[PDB]
């Protein structure tokens, strides 16, 4: 969750992510989990506040052993009446050294010990003796978490009873620059070879510096290269920047670098520094 700051901004955010169809949205430290957020601006321009993220994460290493604890070795409420109770911290001194299989837990093979020390560990019944529904029935359950490893045994069904809810909550900077202006270059293509069916990437920018520059790049062509010389003609509106191009060549190292290290610069008229370029080759 990303939310409002501590001012009277009332920003019309609409993006969110609650885990609504799952309760178990996993992650494995090699893929993305990109989360996207639409923070649409309120009645004024969007300011420079500090926002706050809210993530309700949890590590996997408490979740997976609940079926190894509350299903495998705590089935009957009389077999888990006093057998678990006097050795729960002994179980938490037993299951904390489980060292589960988090190296092949991508494809399958959840709920297996990865053979740390399986044979020497059963000597704990000797120097400390407790109820045999734990002291003798859970070594079979220790074998039942050694072998019998289910790939996906619907682990969100037995999750919510024992999974703790950690909650990191970092800041969110809305980090930006401050110079608003605009531009509109216009263009008309001059024939080289044949029309190659040009395709657009984008047009936007954001910059602030000292002896400041705003570089631009052309569209993207998907025919044979060294293509048509785009002839351009400016309408450098709403400011007085500094041009640096005239009639470039559209598949090359040319770049219509409309630099702006100058005056006539309004400040903070939008969410950041912005200068909507919007080149038009029509």
């Amino acid at each position: 969750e990303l939310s409002a700051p501590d001012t009277r901004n009332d920003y019309n955010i609409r993006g969110d992510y609650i885990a609504t169809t799952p309760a178990l949205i996993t992650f494995d430290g090699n893929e993305s989990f990109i989360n996207c957020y639409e923070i649409t601006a309120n009645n004024n321009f969007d300011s420079k506040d500090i926002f706050n993220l809210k993530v309700r994460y949890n590590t996997l290493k408490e979740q997976l052993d609940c079926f190894i604890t509350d299903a495998v070795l705590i089935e009957g409420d009389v077999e888990w009446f006093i057998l678990f109770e006097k050795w729960k911290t002994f179980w938490e001194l037993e299951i904390l050294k489980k060292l589960k299989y988090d190296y092949d837990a991508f494809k399958e093979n959840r709920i297996i010990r990865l053979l740390k020390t399986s044979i020497d560990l059963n000597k704990t019944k000797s120097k400390i003796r407790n109820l045999c529904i734990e002291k003798a029935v859970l070594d079979k359950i220790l074998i039942c978490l050694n072998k019998v490893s289910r790939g996906i045994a619907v682990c969100n069904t037995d999750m919510d009873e024992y999974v703790r809810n950690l909650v990191p909550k970092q800041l969110t900077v809305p980090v930006q620059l401050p110079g608003f202006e605009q531009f509109f270059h216009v263009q008309f293509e001059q024939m080289e070879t044949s029309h190659d069916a040009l395709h657009d990437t984008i047009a936007t920018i954001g910059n602030s510096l000292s002896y400041t520059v705003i570089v631009e790049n052309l569209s993207g062509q998907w025919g044979q290269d060294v293509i048509d010389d785009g002839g351009y003609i400016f309408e450098i509106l709403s400011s007085n920047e500094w041009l640096i191009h005239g009639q470039k060549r559209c598949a090359i190292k040319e770049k219509r670098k409309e630099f702006e290290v100058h005056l006539i610069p309004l400040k903070k008229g939008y969410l950041n520094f912005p200068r909507v370029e919007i080149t038009n080759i029509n």
Binding site: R14, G15, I25, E31, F33, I34, C36, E38, E108, I152
Partner: protein, 292 residues
Amino acid sequence: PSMDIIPLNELFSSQVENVDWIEYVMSKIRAESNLHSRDFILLLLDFRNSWIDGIKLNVQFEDFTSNEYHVEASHTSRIIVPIKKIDYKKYNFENTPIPRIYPGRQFIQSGLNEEQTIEMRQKFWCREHIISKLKCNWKLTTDQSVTGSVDFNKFIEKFDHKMVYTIYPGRLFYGVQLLLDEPKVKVGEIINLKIITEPTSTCRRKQNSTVNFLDIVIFDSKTSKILPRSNRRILYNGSLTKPISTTKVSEINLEIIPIEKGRYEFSVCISKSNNQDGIIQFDSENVILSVI
């Protein structure tokens, strides 16, 4: 003396609607407004004349018609017929037909006996479906009235493995449709995408990983798919891998928060695992949407 089978993807246009098969598939799809294409595959017969005059070569498949296919002396010509592909949710195809000499020899199978014995059964049963309708009538060019037919059971060789999953869905694993909200959304708007997957009868080869990992890949409707970091193009919630069961009709979702685009495309693939070379099929269901 050859054979090839090719699927279909373009809806086509009205100004070219004058050759026989495209006006047949368009005319068939004026009603029944759930199918559009990818279900009207197209088989390529190639007639060859080992004789000394022209012949005129009609072909009728089911209600398909032809033109006056004037063939020549030793000229091969290629004749194009469209068929709706054989659905395995209208049938079952696990029956061997016994031949017409009941000699009771009671032979063996002698392969992976649950795989090749029904796999070659899949082959000549799909050949039974192709043979049992396909009809030709030929008359010699302005020198006779010899209007005969042309049998095919000495001609269609076998089916190779391309010509099984081209003709018969249910050779590869998951039937997939893609259910979408709108194709004509503006920029600043959020869309649930909903794929719907159907695991098959022929998942019986494995059962081991009940979980099976898909992907969703986004193509530009020119070429060259966008990366995972789809910067300023498309936005989404979470990693797209989003597993399905080999149990029943699982569903899945994303939130295609569009930004500054036009004319995208969505399609999936099936990967069984997380590792490379885990990928086992690529579906072809390509729902396109436009962004204004």
